[model samples]
Target chain A: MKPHPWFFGKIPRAKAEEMLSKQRHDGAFLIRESESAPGDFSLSVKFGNDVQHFKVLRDGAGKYFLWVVKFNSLNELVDYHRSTSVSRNQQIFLRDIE
Target chain B: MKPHPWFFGKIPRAKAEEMLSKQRHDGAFLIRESESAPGDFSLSVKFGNDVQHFKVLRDGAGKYFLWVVKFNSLNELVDYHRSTSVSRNQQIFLRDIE
Candidate 1:
């Protein structure tokens, strides 16, 4: 069975826009952005770093904001098959073992 | 030499306070909170999750806010020696290798 999809918390619309702008200007070609809810203060960003895929978390309070970046090895980030192909010799293991 | 301190990014005061309150109410006894700058929108929280230490990131925009949580194995979170002591035999390695 597939493992549970981990949840990344909330962020605001403006802050999310800012992050996307930064990634578009500074990061590589690949960029993905999404929000946790319609008006809640949470957003997630995924982009390709030179060596791996990087995910960023941004949350918004009514009058403030926060963010974090998670840099993970390609093999560890993508699915087992995709990770194996991208990472080549690197081992890619699933989190849940049945 | 000790490695350069990795930057977590920015969060705001009110948002920071809310996160601290949540950790105190829900998480373990160990709670640490700090901000990046005087009034810039950034804050960090470190607390103990079930099997490891987890960090929460929050940032604030002028009218909104955001947050994300990172769950790391105890060893992967604390020091190398500390990580092994925690369950699941998790290897918490530093991101920057020298």
Candidate 2:
């Protein structure tokens, strides 16, 4: 399957934040490759009038995880957050950016 | 919600066809506003090595329908096709274009 709409590769973190902030929609978000760690990913999400960044960790088996839940692919990780909550303290859904 | 990944507004039909053709993925598809019919929409889908176009009809109630099923919104229509078949005779799932 092709990458989901939320995944945008090679974009700077500032750009992702700008994109989400312009939308002004709570939960608007996108995933980009981590600048400091190649092959890893970061999720930039708009929430509470600001953008928050989260790192996505990958295990040796190629599985990806953001918190306690491990997913087989980035798409699965995104789908999980879409159906569930992205944060434990808040109801942060990973809304896809336009 | 913002427009889904598959919906491209105000684009030429040729461009939509080109976009899907380049993806070259079976069932890859997108929705576009109809050029000839303002306020209406169209479904451009890739199937069986070719791109097929179908008009999306909107009723007086502002509901959209492709064949028999009617949806309250374009996103609902897309979600329906994603879970079900886009075509009656074939297993044509509406695979969103990246």
Candidate 3:
């Protein structure tokens, strides 16, 4: 989870496709990269500083999507997890859990 | 997202409660710390190099959890996501979608 911008390279939100170009084995390492699938908009890889630790309900689905968007310093991080959640506007679904 | 060993203060898996001690406003920062709530075991803040990008189904409850465990360098990160997905060993309620 190296927070350096270049660490994962300027991935747009959860758009980490460009970084998934190829898998190379360096020395004694088996790296995993890709060219087929790029990334997922539903996935958000981020860190924050406003929250410490807790749980809550999200989406109209009301699913218990856990959120751990906390950080020590904004000097090296943001203010929230990089997820868009499941969308409070989902199928409105069977309705999220209670 | 800061992947330094001391960054999250050696949080065990998603066990970041120890780091959630108290909130502090630095020179000009709004830091989020805690004492009550800590972290979630379901959440895994990790970096990887094996996978590049993709999505899939999970759990007998049949959830569509996404995964993006890719990386450029290993010296700065690990491999695969830190999450346990929803657990293929869960509910066994309905059935997973292929």
- Best model number under TM-score: 2
Model 2 Cα lDDT, one tens digit per residue, B1-98: 22246655545678887778887668888766565654446798988667888888756544668788877555567778987998877888888675
Badly placed stretches (over 4 Å) of model 2 are A1-98, B1-3
Which regions in candidate 1 have their CA more than 4 angstroms from the true location? A1-98, B1-8, B24-98
Model 3: residues with Cα > 4 Å off, grouped in runs? A1-15, A22-98, B1-10, B13-15, B24-40, B43-59, B64-98
| lDDT, candidate 2, A22-91, per-residue tens | 8767888877756565444688889977888889875554456877877755556777898798888788
Query: For model 1, how does the per-residue alpha-carbon lDDT over A4-95 read when each residue is reduced to its tens digit?
Result: 12221232344444444454322211222224332222223323332233233222322222222122221123232232222233432222
Q: Which ten residues in a row have the lowest lDDT in candidate 2 chain B?
A: B1-10
The deviation in Å at residue B56 for candidate 2 is 0.7
lDDT of 1 at B40: 26
Index of the highest-DockQ prediction: 1
Considering the two chains of model 1, state its CAPRI-style docking category: incorrect
* Local lDDT at A18 for model 3: 27
A-chain TM-score of every model: 0.21, 0.88, 0.18
**DockQ of all predictions against the true structure, Cα-based:** 0.04, 0.03, 0.03
